[PDB]
Amino acid sequence: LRLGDIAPDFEQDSSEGRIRLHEWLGDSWGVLFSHPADFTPVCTTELGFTAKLKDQFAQRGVKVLALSVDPVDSHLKWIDDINETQDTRVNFPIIADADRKVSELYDLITVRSLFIIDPNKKVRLIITYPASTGRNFNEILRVIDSLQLTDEHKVATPANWEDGDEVVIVPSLKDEEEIKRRFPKGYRAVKPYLRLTPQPN
Amino acid sequence: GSHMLRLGDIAPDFEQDSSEGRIRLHEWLGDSWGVLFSHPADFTPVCTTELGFTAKLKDQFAQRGVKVLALSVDPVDSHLKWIDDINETQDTRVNFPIIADADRKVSELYDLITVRSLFIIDPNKKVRLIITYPASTGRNFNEILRVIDSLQLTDEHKVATPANWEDGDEVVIVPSLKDEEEIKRRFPKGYRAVKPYLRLTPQPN
């Protein structure tokens, strides 16, 4: 699976019923989190933050699913532990991938991958962390804010950009009357290739 | 043989020209941690800002014993001109080598042939993290540092960093460690068994 590939559609059982990925997503952004097994400490804490970021995901029109190979009864029992020990409520599906169909489809055969999926079902980011190291969910939101903004405007987000920081005009946009139209907040040519503009609102 | 690198793969050695002389990767790293940053081409705005921030975190990489290399398919002369623009527009001084991969040898070897990859390399030359970001979206240098803090800690002690862990926060005892006598030795500060598989322990010294 490479960036710009279609996120392969699947049908699989889950903690919230049988799920067809593409149909469930509809026109929403997606984040598929994979976890190697239920009742694992790092993963427990990650599914905690994912549940706690319900509203943050909803604001951005992002649907979230987790994936593990353990059965539905295991997932449901694990959700009880997450809800209690992380002081939250898992609101989203954990896919029960017992037959490995979804894991093979996403080339997941210890490390775990997240896949960011756009409304046209394209993989826009693949992040793999080792088992030693839990995710930073601020970074996941900041990348989604980058992708959404750079899909809606001809900008790219610089190093250590946060929502509201100024952005660079994309290098391929070189039409000077087009640049004037598209960026009424104005821009600075710091270099021929480095053009800074306030984030379009 | 050249292929898309996976965690635990050895970061393959090479010899290549750079902005700071002809470099052999494994020899140049020695027993330090390494971060190899790729950049598709010189004079690209996101990449300019990334080499700026990378140069600003000089002290931060050196505190952690981490050596930094950039890599781009462009000659030395082009790299040196670009370093002048980076140093000036980003208010810094690039003090790490930008590899001049003009014959594409290192890019083909790392199978990087628009995205850019960073590889975190441990003392035994193993890839411990790969982050590929698309051209639209600049990296977060705070996260690269936090993951280095996680990997270094989780190599010296038998812990894993939970979600949203920062340096000095509670950690979890790796599941693979289950010998309660060994645990008692290694964690004198003690631990909370929230569940049998979720054992929280203050970050070791």
Exactly one of A19, A21, A43, A96 is catalytic; name it: A43
Which site among A110, A133, A138 would you substitute to test the B interface, given the most B Cβ atoms closer than 10 Å to its Cβ?
Answer: A133
- Going from the C-alpha of B151 to that of each of A31, A37, A61, B104, B188, the distances in angstroms are 25, 21, 33, 30, 22
User: Where are the alpha helices (H) located in chain A, listed in sequence order?
Assistant: 21-25, 41-52, 54-59, 72-85, 101-105, 137-152, 176-182
- Gyration radius of chain A over CA positions: 19
- Going from the C-alpha of A144 to that of each of A23, A29, A62, B47, the distances in angstroms are 21, 9, 9, 19
User: Nearest CA of chain A to the CA of B176: how many Å?
Assistant: 11
Helix (H, G, I), strand (E, B) or coil at A113: strand
Nearest of A66, A16, A62 to residue A43 by alpha carbon: A66
Domains in chain A (CATH in brackets) are 11-134 (3.40.30.10), 153-197 (3.30.1020.10)
CB nearest to A137's CB, from B7, B48, B164:
B164
DSSP B82: H
CB-based burial label for A18 (10 Å; 0-12, 13-18, 19+):
exposed
Helix (H, G, I), strand (E, B) or coil at B171: strand
Question: Which technique was used to obtain these atomic coordinates?
Answer: X-ray
Resolution (A): 2.0
What's the CA angle centered on A57, arms A53 and A58, to 5 degrees? 115
- Contact yes or no for A194 and B52 at CB 8 A: no
Q: Name, in order, each residue with C-beta under 8 angstroms of B123's C-beta and a sequence gap of 6 or more.
A: B31, B32, B33
Q: How far apart are CA B52 and CA B71, in angstroms?
A: 14
Dig out the tokens for A64 from the structure: 């979230």
- Contact yes or no for A156 and B53 at CB 8 A: no
- Going from the C-alpha of B8 to that of each of A121, A200, B128, B166, the distances in angstroms are 30, 42, 6, 24
Exactly one of B5, B23, B36, B47 is catalytic; name it: B47
| DSSP string computed for A174-193 | --HHHHHHH-TT--EEEETT
Exposure on the CB side of residue B151, measured as CA atoms within 13 A:
26
- Contact yes or no for A194 and B164 at CB 8 A: no
Known active-site residue A4: no
